[PDB]
Amino acid sequence: SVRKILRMGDPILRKISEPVTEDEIQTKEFKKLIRDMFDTMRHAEGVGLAAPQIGILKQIVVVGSEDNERYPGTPDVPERIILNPVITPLTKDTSGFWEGCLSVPGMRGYVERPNQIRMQWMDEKGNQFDETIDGYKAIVYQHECDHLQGILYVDRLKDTKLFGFNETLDSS
């Protein structure tokens, strides 16, 4: 089921999320949440969604693309469940990108994030990963993980001048 997505301004989006436990990921409630998050993300044409965005302060993230219409020229992102993620930049190099966020509807802002990162995480089966990630995916993960730290992309704008409403940015 689709859950309501919280908008910037809701203090929940600025709070820190609690990590999920191995016991937790086996409960029906957890499974139902993941299902709703995917429904919610897909319906909103999102490429990622963090639990906080739907009111749950838990380190739960879902990603997944396939011809995303909100971010036109980006590569698809395979569906994954990212739990308790921890990202560490591996480079000072950045690949600027005009980010958007389901919690900041109608806008885009230019953000420069490290283009190569290390991410440690756990999936829905309790498997642990520790991989190097780059490209678009690296941007998505940093964006999603920021949500778990109560961080929104507007907090990382390179320049408030490079920020605006979609329809206007598109016409300019």
Add this chain to the structure above:
Amino acid sequence: SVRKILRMGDPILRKISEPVTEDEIQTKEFKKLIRDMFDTMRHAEGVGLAAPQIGILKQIVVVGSEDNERYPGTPDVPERIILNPVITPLTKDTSGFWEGCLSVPGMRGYVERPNQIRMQWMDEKGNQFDETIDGYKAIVYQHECDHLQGILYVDRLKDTKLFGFNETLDSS
């Protein structure tokens, strides 16, 4: 007549406005612009409006309140035409305020501006003023004059965490 208000993202809002000449303020075109700006500002329930906001890069500003519904507990602002304004802060003291902007629809951001300023300006009749301004009016003038310098209130946010969508901020 009501003119379309430009949204953040339109590069015009970041350009600098040209000062208006004494000859200029006597033309019908100028008079028509002032009329439209007042219509535009009133229709949008604004307390101020700068020419840039409607696509004109000229140092022309109009203000005016009367039970403003967008900014609930604020004192009315008498209608005035402010041309070629120049503001100089007279204090380091600030009176934080959750500002909005007709060019950034649906949002509010906490901004701290000097609460006492000196403003030099010219009205529609070519009269020159040099007064000390404070209170809400001082906030409005700095906000409006920023527009003439290609500055939006999002550029002066005290903290990106104190920024969000109206309906959400209101419920929180």
